[PDB]
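Entry for zinc ion complex. Fields follow.
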Amino acid sequence: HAEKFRAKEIYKSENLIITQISENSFIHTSFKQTNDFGNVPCNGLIVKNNDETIVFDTPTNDKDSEELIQWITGTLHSKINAVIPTHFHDDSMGGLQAFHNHNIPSYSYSKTIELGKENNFVVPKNSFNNFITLKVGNEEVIAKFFGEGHTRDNTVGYFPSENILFGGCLLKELEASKGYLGDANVSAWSSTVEKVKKEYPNVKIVIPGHGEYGDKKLLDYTIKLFK
Ligand SMILES: [Zn+2]
Ligand SMILES: [Zn+2]
C-alpha cells in the first residue's frame, strides 16, 4: 500500500475492524462463521461527509451490525443516511434487521430484493434499477448494477469525491481463488468487471468483498481470473 492517504486501523474488537482508507471512507471488516474454515473476514464500506454516513454491506448478523451502528453513531458521531447491501448473501445483507431496527433506510438493486425473498431473508425497503445516487452531507455515493458475476444481483458502490470503489463480492483480492460459485454467472463475470473498470478509470482504491483492498489491479486481476 502506497496511497497518499496512509491507512489507519482506528477500531479493532474481536468482531469488527474499521480501517480508514481515505479522508472520509472506511472499510468495515467482520466475520462469517463457516462450519468448515472457522471465521472468515467480510468487508463493507463506510463513506462520510460532515456528520452523515452511508454504509455499503451489513455484517452477517444483527449483533455485529449493532456494534457497527453504535461505532458510527457513538465514535464517528454521525447519522447513517442509508445502508446498501450489494448482494443478497449473508455477508452483504445478513444483519439488515438491525439497521431496520434503527429506522435506517435500506436500498438495493431490485434483484437483490427478489433473491432475498426467494431465500426468506430480510430485504431492503427501497429498490432501484439500475443505479441510484444518494446524498451524504454535501457529497454523494453511487450504487450501480453493471451485470452478473458473483451473483446475478451484485452491485458496486462508488464514492467519486475520493475515487473509492466498493466492489463487493464481484471483486476479488489479488491472487484470490474464484470462491463460492453456487450462485454465480461465471460466463458474464469478466465482462461485468470490465464495465466497472471502464466506468471508473480514476479509481484509487478497490475494496473486494473478502480480503485485502488495493488499487485498480484488483479489477485487472478479477477480469483475468474469470476469462
Ligand atoms: Zn456472496
Ligand atoms: Zn462474499
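NOTE: The chain has one domain: 8-225.
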